[PDB]
Amino acid sequence: EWERKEAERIEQKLERSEKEALESYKKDSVEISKYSQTRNYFYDYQIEANSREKEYKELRNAISKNKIDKPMYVYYFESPEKFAFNKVIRTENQNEISLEKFNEFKETIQNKLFKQDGFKDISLYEPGKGDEKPTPLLMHLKLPRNTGMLPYTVSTLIEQGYSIKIDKIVRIVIDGKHYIKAEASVVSSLDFKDDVSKGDSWGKANYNDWSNKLTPNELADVNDYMRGGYTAINNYLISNGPVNNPNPELDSKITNIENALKREPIPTNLTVYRRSGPQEFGLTLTSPEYDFNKLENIDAFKSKWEGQALSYPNFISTSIGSVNMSAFAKRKIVLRITIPKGSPGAYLSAIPGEYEVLLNHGSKFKINKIDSYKDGTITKLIVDATLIP
Protein backbone atom coordinates (compact mmCIF):
# COMPACT_ATOMS: atom_id res chain seq x y z
CA GLU A 1 0.00 0.00 0.00
CA TRP A 2 3.02 2.29 0.49
CA GLU A 3 3.62 2.62 -3.28
CA ARG A 4 0.16 4.08 -3.95
CA LYS A 5 0.62 6.73 -1.24
CA GLU A 6 4.19 7.39 -2.46
CA ALA A 7 2.84 8.03 -5.98
CA GLU A 8 0.31 10.46 -4.46
CA ARG A 9 3.23 12.22 -2.76
CA ILE A 10 5.21 12.35 -6.02
CA GLU A 11 2.32 14.10 -7.83
CA GLN A 12 2.37 16.81 -5.14
CA LYS A 13 5.99 17.50 -6.16
CA LEU A 14 4.69 18.71 -9.52
CA GLU A 15 3.59 22.14 -10.66
CA ARG A 16 -0.15 22.33 -11.34
CA SER A 17 0.32 22.44 -15.14
CA GLU A 18 2.40 19.26 -14.80
CA LYS A 19 -0.24 17.66 -12.53
CA GLU A 20 -2.73 18.60 -15.27
CA ALA A 21 -0.65 16.78 -17.91
CA LEU A 22 -0.29 13.70 -15.66
CA GLU A 23 -4.07 13.51 -15.17
CA SER A 24 -4.56 13.55 -18.94
CA TYR A 25 -1.95 10.79 -19.22
CA LYS A 26 -3.84 8.69 -16.61
CA LYS A 27 -7.01 8.86 -18.77
CA ASP A 28 -5.33 8.10 -22.11
CA SER A 29 -1.65 7.22 -22.42
CA VAL A 30 -1.71 5.60 -25.88
CA GLU A 31 -2.05 8.65 -28.13
CA ILE A 32 0.31 10.91 -26.16
CA SER A 33 2.99 8.18 -26.07
CA LYS A 34 2.63 7.58 -29.82
CA TYR A 35 2.92 11.36 -30.32
CA SER A 36 6.03 11.54 -28.09
CA GLN A 37 7.86 9.08 -30.38
CA THR A 38 7.79 11.04 -33.66
CA ARG A 39 6.81 14.63 -32.64
CA ASN A 40 10.28 15.98 -33.50
CA TYR A 41 10.21 15.06 -37.24
CA PHE A 42 7.63 17.68 -38.09
CA TYR A 43 8.13 21.37 -38.96
CA ASP A 44 8.76 23.65 -36.01
CA TYR A 45 5.38 25.38 -36.47
CA GLN A 46 3.71 22.02 -36.99
CA ILE A 47 5.07 20.91 -33.60
CA GLU A 48 3.95 24.16 -31.97
CA ALA A 49 0.41 23.80 -33.39
CA ASN A 50 -0.18 20.19 -32.29
CA SER A 51 -2.99 19.77 -29.74
CA ARG A 52 -0.81 17.31 -27.79
CA GLU A 53 2.35 19.46 -27.66
CA LYS A 54 1.59 21.29 -24.38
CA GLU A 55 0.80 17.93 -22.72
CA TYR A 56 4.09 16.53 -24.04
CA LYS A 57 6.18 19.44 -22.71
CA GLU A 58 4.55 19.42 -19.25
CA LEU A 59 4.85 15.62 -18.92
CA ARG A 60 8.50 15.79 -20.04
CA ASN A 61 9.11 18.38 -17.28
CA ALA A 62 7.12 16.34 -14.74
CA ILE A 63 9.40 13.33 -15.32
CA SER A 64 12.53 15.50 -14.82
CA LYS A 65 11.25 16.52 -11.34
CA ASN A 66 12.00 13.01 -10.00
CA LYS A 67 15.60 12.05 -10.88
CA ILE A 68 17.39 8.98 -9.49
CA ASP A 69 20.79 9.61 -7.84
CA LYS A 70 22.11 6.23 -9.13
CA PRO A 71 21.61 3.84 -12.08
CA MET A 72 18.29 1.99 -11.98
CA TYR A 73 16.95 -1.10 -13.73
CA VAL A 74 13.46 -1.08 -15.21
CA TYR A 75 11.21 -3.72 -16.79
CA TYR A 76 8.95 -3.31 -19.81
CA PHE A 77 7.64 -5.37 -22.70
CA GLU A 78 8.62 -4.54 -26.26
CA SER A 79 7.97 -5.78 -29.80
CA PRO A 80 10.95 -7.60 -31.36
CA GLU A 81 10.24 -5.49 -34.50
CA LYS A 82 11.61 -2.57 -32.45
CA PHE A 83 15.00 -4.32 -32.81
CA ALA A 84 14.69 -5.20 -36.50
CA PHE A 85 13.44 -8.76 -35.88
CA ASN A 86 10.40 -8.56 -38.18
CA LYS A 87 8.80 -11.88 -37.27
CA VAL A 88 7.57 -13.48 -34.04
CA ILE A 89 9.82 -14.89 -31.35
CA ARG A 90 6.82 -17.20 -30.82
CA THR A 91 3.07 -16.89 -31.35
CA GLU A 92 0.99 -15.66 -28.39
CA ASN A 93 -0.89 -19.00 -28.25
CA GLN A 94 2.47 -20.75 -27.66
CA ASN A 95 4.47 -21.46 -24.50
CA GLU A 96 7.85 -22.39 -25.97
CA ILE A 97 10.60 -20.40 -27.67
CA SER A 98 12.94 -22.52 -29.81
CA LEU A 99 16.69 -22.23 -29.23
CA GLU A 100 17.10 -21.42 -32.95
CA LYS A 101 14.90 -18.34 -32.46
CA PHE A 102 16.97 -17.42 -29.42
CA ASN A 103 20.18 -17.54 -31.47
CA GLU A 104 18.53 -15.70 -34.38
CA PHE A 105 17.43 -12.85 -32.07
CA LYS A 106 20.93 -12.77 -30.55
CA GLU A 107 22.48 -12.55 -34.05
CA THR A 108 20.10 -9.67 -34.87
CA ILE A 109 20.76 -7.39 -31.87
CA GLN A 110 24.45 -8.33 -31.57
CA ASN A 111 26.84 -5.35 -31.40
CA LYS A 112 24.26 -2.79 -32.56
CA LEU A 113 22.82 0.43 -31.13
CA PHE A 114 19.06 1.02 -31.18
CA LYS A 115 17.41 4.41 -30.68
CA GLN A 116 14.56 4.41 -28.15
CA ASP A 117 12.15 7.35 -27.90
CA GLY A 118 8.92 8.54 -26.28
CA PHE A 119 6.93 7.92 -23.10
CA LYS A 120 6.91 4.41 -21.60
CA ASP A 121 5.33 2.75 -18.54
CA ILE A 122 7.84 0.64 -16.63
CA SER A 123 8.07 -1.62 -13.57
CA LEU A 124 10.86 -1.84 -10.99
CA TYR A 125 9.92 -5.50 -10.50
CA GLU A 126 9.87 -8.60 -12.71
CA PRO A 127 6.35 -9.18 -14.16
CA GLY A 128 4.27 -12.08 -12.80
CA LYS A 129 1.00 -14.00 -13.33
CA GLY A 130 -1.34 -11.01 -13.00
CA ASP A 131 0.55 -8.35 -14.97
CA GLU A 132 -0.14 -7.77 -18.68
CA LYS A 133 2.55 -9.47 -20.79
CA PRO A 134 1.73 -8.53 -24.41
CA THR A 135 4.90 -9.81 -26.15
CA PRO A 136 7.57 -12.54 -25.78
CA LEU A 137 10.31 -9.90 -25.26
CA LEU A 138 10.91 -8.43 -21.80
CA MET A 139 13.34 -5.53 -21.57
CA HIS A 140 15.47 -5.19 -18.45
CA LEU A 141 17.10 -1.80 -18.97
CA LYS A 142 19.79 -0.04 -16.95
CA LEU A 143 18.88 3.65 -16.79
CA PRO A 144 21.88 5.95 -16.35
CA ARG A 145 22.32 8.11 -13.24
CA ASN A 146 20.17 11.29 -13.04
CA THR A 147 17.26 9.86 -15.10
CA GLY A 148 13.73 11.04 -14.35
CA MET A 149 11.16 8.50 -13.24
CA LEU A 150 7.54 9.32 -12.38
CA PRO A 151 5.58 6.84 -10.25
CA TYR A 152 1.83 7.50 -10.60
CA THR A 153 -1.52 5.81 -9.83
CA VAL A 154 0.64 2.12 -9.48
CA SER A 155 2.86 2.33 -12.54
CA THR A 156 5.97 4.39 -13.38
CA LEU A 157 6.44 6.79 -16.31
CA ILE A 158 9.79 7.44 -18.04
CA GLU A 159 10.76 9.26 -21.24
CA GLN A 160 13.15 7.37 -23.49
CA GLY A 161 15.54 9.40 -25.65
CA TYR A 162 18.75 7.39 -26.02
CA SER A 163 20.61 4.68 -27.92
CA ILE A 164 20.44 1.29 -26.21
CA LYS A 165 22.48 -1.88 -26.60
CA ILE A 166 21.36 -5.36 -25.60
CA ASP A 167 24.38 -6.92 -23.90
CA LYS A 168 22.88 -10.33 -23.03
CA ILE A 169 19.69 -12.33 -23.52
CA VAL A 170 18.30 -14.99 -21.16
CA ARG A 171 15.32 -17.34 -21.38
CA ILE A 172 12.80 -16.89 -18.56
CA VAL A 173 9.53 -18.61 -17.66
CA ILE A 174 6.42 -16.94 -16.28
CA ASP A 175 3.31 -19.07 -15.68
CA GLY A 176 4.59 -21.72 -18.15
CA LYS A 177 5.22 -19.16 -20.91
CA HIS A 178 8.79 -18.60 -22.09
CA TYR A 179 10.12 -15.08 -22.71
CA ILE A 180 13.34 -13.52 -23.88
CA LYS A 181 14.64 -11.22 -21.17
CA ALA A 182 17.09 -8.77 -22.73
CA GLU A 183 19.76 -7.12 -20.57
CA ALA A 184 20.19 -3.64 -22.01
CA SER A 185 22.09 -0.47 -21.20
CA VAL A 186 22.23 3.12 -22.46
CA VAL A 187 25.03 4.48 -24.64
CA SER A 188 25.14 8.26 -24.16
CA SER A 189 24.64 10.57 -27.11
CA LEU A 190 23.89 14.20 -27.74
CA ASP A 191 20.53 14.36 -29.52
CA PHE A 192 18.93 17.78 -29.92
CA LYS A 193 15.92 16.40 -31.81
CA ASP A 194 13.59 19.33 -32.69
CA ASP A 195 15.54 21.93 -30.63
CA VAL A 196 17.58 23.36 -33.52
CA SER A 197 18.51 26.51 -31.59
CA LYS A 198 20.21 24.53 -28.81
CA GLY A 199 21.80 22.32 -31.50
CA ASP A 200 23.07 25.41 -33.31
CA SER A 201 24.45 26.76 -30.02
CA TRP A 202 26.41 23.53 -29.56
CA GLY A 203 27.62 23.56 -33.16
CA LYS A 204 28.90 27.13 -32.91
CA ALA A 205 30.55 26.41 -29.55
CA ASN A 206 32.41 23.41 -30.92
CA TYR A 207 33.29 24.82 -34.35
CA ASN A 208 33.72 28.64 -33.96
CA ASP A 209 37.50 28.34 -34.07
CA TRP A 210 37.58 25.52 -36.64
CA SER A 211 38.07 28.04 -39.48
CA ASN A 212 41.22 29.30 -37.72
CA LYS A 213 42.53 25.73 -37.51
CA LEU A 214 42.27 25.29 -41.29
CA THR A 215 44.98 26.14 -43.81
CA PRO A 216 44.10 28.85 -46.36
CA ASN A 217 43.72 26.17 -49.10
CA GLU A 218 41.34 24.19 -46.86
CA LEU A 219 39.31 27.26 -45.88
CA ALA A 220 38.95 28.28 -49.55
CA ASP A 221 37.72 24.82 -50.54
CA VAL A 222 35.29 24.49 -47.62
CA ASN A 223 33.92 27.92 -48.58
CA ASP A 224 33.51 26.84 -52.22
CA TYR A 225 31.65 23.65 -51.20
CA MET A 226 29.20 25.58 -48.98
CA ARG A 227 28.55 28.20 -51.68
CA GLY A 228 27.18 25.61 -54.14
CA GLY A 229 30.33 23.77 -55.22
CA TYR A 230 28.90 20.71 -53.47
CA THR A 231 26.65 19.84 -56.42
CA ALA A 232 29.61 19.43 -58.82
CA ILE A 233 31.71 17.66 -56.17
CA ASN A 234 29.00 15.24 -55.05
CA ASN A 235 27.67 14.49 -58.58
CA TYR A 236 31.27 13.71 -59.57
CA LEU A 237 31.71 11.38 -56.57
CA ILE A 238 28.33 9.64 -57.04
CA SER A 239 29.04 8.88 -60.73
CA ASN A 240 32.47 7.42 -59.80
CA GLY A 241 34.09 10.28 -61.73
CA PRO A 242 37.55 9.87 -60.12
CA VAL A 243 37.76 6.52 -61.99
CA ASN A 244 35.74 6.88 -65.22
CA ASN A 245 36.11 10.64 -65.86
CA PRO A 246 38.90 12.03 -63.62
CA ASN A 247 38.83 15.71 -62.62
CA PRO A 248 42.15 16.57 -60.88
CA GLU A 249 40.80 19.98 -59.76
CA LEU A 250 37.72 18.45 -58.10
CA ASP A 251 39.92 15.70 -56.58
CA SER A 252 42.06 18.38 -54.91
CA LYS A 253 38.99 20.14 -53.45
CA ILE A 254 37.76 16.79 -52.10
CA THR A 255 41.12 16.07 -50.44
CA ASN A 256 41.12 19.54 -48.82
CA ILE A 257 37.56 19.19 -47.49
CA GLU A 258 38.29 15.70 -46.16
CA ASN A 259 41.34 17.10 -44.32
CA ALA A 260 39.31 19.99 -42.87
CA LEU A 261 36.75 17.49 -41.51
CA LYS A 262 39.53 15.44 -39.86
CA ARG A 263 41.02 18.54 -38.21
CA GLU A 264 38.47 18.84 -35.39
CA PRO A 265 36.74 15.44 -34.90
CA ILE A 266 33.22 15.15 -33.47
CA PRO A 267 34.12 15.30 -29.73
CA THR A 268 31.12 13.39 -28.34
CA ASN A 269 28.60 10.77 -29.52
CA LEU A 270 26.23 12.86 -31.61
CA THR A 271 22.93 12.15 -33.37
CA VAL A 272 22.27 14.01 -36.65
CA TYR A 273 19.50 13.90 -39.24
CA ARG A 274 19.53 13.75 -43.02
CA ARG A 275 16.43 14.01 -45.17
CA SER A 276 17.34 11.54 -47.92
CA GLY A 277 16.23 11.34 -51.55
CA PRO A 278 15.66 8.02 -53.39
CA GLN A 279 19.04 7.96 -55.24
CA GLU A 280 21.09 7.49 -52.03
CA PHE A 281 19.23 4.20 -51.55
CA GLY A 282 19.58 3.06 -55.18
CA LEU A 283 16.23 4.31 -56.48
CA THR A 284 15.65 6.76 -59.36
CA LEU A 285 13.82 10.02 -58.56
CA THR A 286 10.79 8.65 -60.47
CA SER A 287 10.84 5.18 -58.81
CA PRO A 288 7.40 3.72 -57.95
CA GLU A 289 9.34 1.79 -55.26
CA TYR A 290 10.03 5.08 -53.44
CA ASP A 291 6.35 5.50 -52.45
CA PHE A 292 5.97 4.34 -48.84
CA ASN A 293 2.21 4.91 -48.74
CA LYS A 294 2.21 1.38 -50.19
CA LEU A 295 3.22 -1.18 -47.54
CA GLU A 296 4.88 -3.45 -50.13
CA ASN A 297 7.46 -0.69 -50.76
CA ILE A 298 8.36 -0.48 -47.06
CA ASP A 299 8.81 -4.27 -46.87
CA ALA A 300 11.07 -4.18 -49.95
CA PHE A 301 13.08 -1.30 -48.45
CA LYS A 302 13.65 -3.04 -45.10
CA SER A 303 14.58 -6.27 -46.91
CA LYS A 304 17.23 -4.40 -48.94
CA TRP A 305 18.69 -2.17 -46.20
CA GLU A 306 17.78 -3.19 -42.65
CA GLY A 307 20.80 -4.77 -40.92
CA GLN A 308 22.99 -3.91 -43.93
CA ALA A 309 25.81 -1.41 -44.59
CA LEU A 310 25.39 1.69 -46.74
CA SER A 311 28.35 3.56 -48.20
CA TYR A 312 28.12 7.11 -49.55
CA PRO A 313 30.56 8.06 -52.35
CA ASN A 314 29.75 11.76 -51.82
CA PHE A 315 30.06 13.97 -48.73
CA ILE A 316 27.01 13.62 -46.48
CA SER A 317 25.17 16.78 -45.45
CA THR A 318 23.21 16.35 -42.20
CA SER A 319 21.36 18.56 -39.68
CA ILE A 320 21.77 18.83 -35.87
CA GLY A 321 17.96 18.98 -35.78
CA SER A 322 15.35 16.39 -36.83
CA VAL A 323 12.74 18.98 -37.78
CA ASN A 324 11.34 19.03 -41.35
CA MET A 325 12.36 22.00 -43.54
CA SER A 326 10.98 23.46 -46.80
CA ALA A 327 14.21 22.49 -48.60
CA PHE A 328 13.46 18.82 -47.81
CA ALA A 329 9.64 18.95 -48.04
CA LYS A 330 9.22 16.13 -50.57
CA ARG A 331 11.79 13.73 -49.10
CA LYS A 332 10.36 10.54 -47.63
CA ILE A 333 13.36 9.23 -45.68
CA VAL A 334 14.85 10.56 -42.48
CA LEU A 335 18.30 9.10 -41.95
CA ARG A 336 18.99 9.33 -38.21
CA ILE A 337 22.75 8.93 -37.77
CA THR A 338 24.62 8.34 -34.51
CA ILE A 339 28.18 9.62 -34.92
CA PRO A 340 30.72 8.08 -32.52
CA LYS A 341 33.12 10.45 -30.75
CA GLY A 342 36.29 10.78 -32.81
CA SER A 343 34.63 10.62 -36.24
CA PRO A 344 35.63 13.16 -38.89
CA GLY A 345 33.00 15.91 -39.11
CA ALA A 346 32.34 19.63 -38.76
CA TYR A 347 29.47 21.97 -38.04
CA LEU A 348 29.70 24.05 -41.25
CA SER A 349 27.08 26.54 -40.04
CA ALA A 350 29.70 27.86 -37.61
CA ILE A 351 30.98 29.78 -40.65
CA PRO A 352 28.79 32.94 -41.30
CA GLY A 353 27.66 31.98 -44.85
CA GLU A 354 21.32 26.08 -41.64
CA TYR A 355 22.30 23.68 -38.82
CA GLU A 356 24.58 21.65 -41.09
CA VAL A 357 27.00 18.93 -40.03
CA LEU A 358 29.14 17.55 -42.86
CA LEU A 359 30.40 13.98 -42.81
CA ASN A 360 33.33 12.68 -44.82
CA HIS A 361 32.99 11.24 -48.32
CA GLY A 362 33.21 7.47 -48.53
CA SER A 363 31.59 7.05 -45.11
CA LYS A 364 29.83 3.76 -44.33
CA PHE A 365 26.70 3.51 -42.20
CA LYS A 366 25.26 0.44 -40.49
CA ILE A 367 21.47 0.50 -40.74
CA ASN A 368 20.22 -0.87 -37.40
CA LYS A 369 16.45 -0.37 -37.65
CA ILE A 370 13.89 1.17 -40.02
CA ASP A 371 10.49 2.50 -38.91
CA SER A 372 7.66 4.38 -40.61
CA TYR A 373 5.53 7.30 -39.43
CA LYS A 374 2.65 9.35 -40.80
CA ASP A 375 3.34 12.97 -41.69
CA GLY A 376 -0.18 14.03 -42.58
CA THR A 377 -0.98 11.48 -45.29
CA ILE A 378 2.60 10.90 -46.51
CA THR A 379 4.23 7.87 -44.92
CA LYS A 380 7.90 8.52 -44.33
CA LEU A 381 10.66 6.26 -43.03
CA ILE A 382 13.07 6.77 -40.14
CA VAL A 383 16.36 4.99 -40.78
CA ASP A 384 18.28 4.40 -37.54
CA ALA A 385 21.93 4.09 -38.60
CA THR A 386 25.40 4.25 -37.02
CA LEU A 387 28.50 5.74 -38.63
CA ILE A 388 31.26 3.12 -38.71
CA PRO A 389 34.68 4.19 -37.33
CSV table of C-alpha atoms in Angstrom, one decimal, residues 14 18 52 55 69 77 81-84 97 125 142 145 162 168 181 185 201 225 244 258 270 278 340 345 359 371 382:
chain,number,residue,atom,x,y,z
A,14,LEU,CA,4.7,18.7,-9.5
A,18,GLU,CA,2.4,19.3,-14.8
A,52,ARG,CA,-0.8,17.3,-27.8
A,55,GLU,CA,0.8,17.9,-22.7
A,69,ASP,CA,20.8,9.6,-7.8
A,77,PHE,CA,7.6,-5.4,-22.7
A,81,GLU,CA,10.2,-5.5,-34.5
A,82,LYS,CA,11.6,-2.6,-32.5
A,83,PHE,CA,15.0,-4.3,-32.8
A,84,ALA,CA,14.7,-5.2,-36.5
A,97,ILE,CA,10.6,-20.4,-27.7
A,125,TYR,CA,9.9,-5.5,-10.5
A,142,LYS,CA,19.8,0.0,-17.0
A,145,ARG,CA,22.3,8.1,-13.2
A,162,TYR,CA,18.8,7.4,-26.0
A,168,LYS,CA,22.9,-10.3,-23.0
A,181,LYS,CA,14.6,-11.2,-21.2
A,185,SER,CA,22.1,-0.5,-21.2
A,201,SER,CA,24.5,26.8,-30.0
A,225,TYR,CA,31.6,23.7,-51.2
A,244,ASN,CA,35.7,6.9,-65.2
A,258,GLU,CA,38.3,15.7,-46.2
A,270,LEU,CA,26.2,12.9,-31.6
A,278,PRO,CA,15.7,8.0,-53.4
A,340,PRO,CA,30.7,8.1,-32.5
A,345,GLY,CA,33.0,15.9,-39.1
A,359,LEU,CA,30.4,14.0,-42.8
A,371,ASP,CA,10.5,2.5,-38.9
A,382,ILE,CA,13.1,6.8,-40.1
